[PDB]
Design a protein around this ligand. Sequence first.
Ligand SMILES: *Cc1cc2c(cc1C)nc1c(=O)[nH]c(=O)nc-1n2C[C@H](O)[C@H](O)[C@H](O)COP(=O)(O)OP(=O)(O)OC[C@H]1O[C@@H](n2cnc3c(N)ncnc32)[C@H](O)[C@@H]1O
Ligand code: NA
Length: 371
Amino acid sequence: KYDLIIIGSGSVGAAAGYYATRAGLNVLMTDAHMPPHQHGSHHGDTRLIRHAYGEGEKYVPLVLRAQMLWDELSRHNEDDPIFVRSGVINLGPADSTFLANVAHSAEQWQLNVEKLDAQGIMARWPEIRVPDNYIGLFETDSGFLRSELAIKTWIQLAKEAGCAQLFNCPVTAIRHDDDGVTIETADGEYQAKKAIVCAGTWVKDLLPELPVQPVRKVFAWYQADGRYSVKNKFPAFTGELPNGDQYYGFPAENDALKIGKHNGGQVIHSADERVPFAEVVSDGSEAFPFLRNVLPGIGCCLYGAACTYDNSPDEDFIIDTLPGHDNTLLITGLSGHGFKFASVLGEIAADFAQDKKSDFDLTPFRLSRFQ
Ligand SMILES: *Cc1cc2c(cc1C)nc1c(=O)[nH]c(=O)nc-1n2C[C@H](O)[C@H](O)[C@H](O)COP(=O)(O)OP(=O)(O)OC[C@H]1O[C@@H](n2cnc3c(N)ncnc32)[C@H](O)[C@@H]1O
Ligand code: NA
């Protein structure tokens, strides 16, 4: 009898719950665990945000709206900023398709991005060391996000707003009537007028036909020092190697620099198959090829993580209503660059719930593409 059932109250679903309840809807929130947990793709301290987007021009207006919502959310917690404006530097070769989309999309949307020289960056940040052939695009208004905190707050805000939340209770199957959507759980049976499916990286074993492939990814913490910090103006980064390998990174927190590879990772299929940090042996030395070249004074790996990419076959998002049911909307294509969008994706779901209006065009996130 609910107005809306959220299947996965994770990073996308947590937003979806808050916005849909604040919209004034009778909402049910579900997860398999206790939302800020270690079983999804929201754990680890931080998640990156970039406006001038190298992945594609199609993302820009959404991440711009996302940023607005992150700013509005950060308001609710004074002692702990959810968004930190450290800035984001984009590193890579001058003739790269990725940096070509950062520069082009900065121009159209009037974004604060500085083209910087190979010698220029080394002169501004002595610690960052690139080939002479390289170029850097510094983003001023960008930075990163406290991913765990973002969930934590979205839940309590929803919980206070009268949202019904069923957390440690996995969903087992989705059923369709003609009015709305039923979900049978190992607990009981609940239904709503509409539904949003955001079970994330394991939605496959709840909706098997989807063309999304979970992949074991890992980020790690290396030993840094005060001059690699936000205090010393050190920015969060994305790098390209002559390899074509992409790396993401964050300004050293308390004497620790967080890095990760983006392009690789070993393919898995079960939640059990996600072996913890040090268990497979690429992990401890995964960020090394970037670190010795680009950040040579960065030292040893200290500890690290265990996350999973929700990969689509073209690496773009899947934001579409289910093939047979306009009744239900799913968000799942988020292939490792989705958290920055969490806030905006919850809003468009809240809009969807009260059959409201987009602004954005979600055409390139069709389910149709494939075939
Ligand atoms: C893997 C990864 C991702 C990542 C990243 C680094 C790594 C190693 N760095 C990022 C970054 O720097 N900047 C950025 O914008 N994104 C980055 N990402 C991607 C990001 O983590 C993900 O896009 C996003 O966090 C995941 O979104 P989503 O909401 O779809 O997935 P989730 O947070 O894990 O939430 C899903 C929830 O659903 C629950 N669940 C799963 N199955 C069920 C069933 N069947 N029943 C009920 N609930 C279910 C999960 O428990 C989870 O809480
Ligand atoms: Na993901």
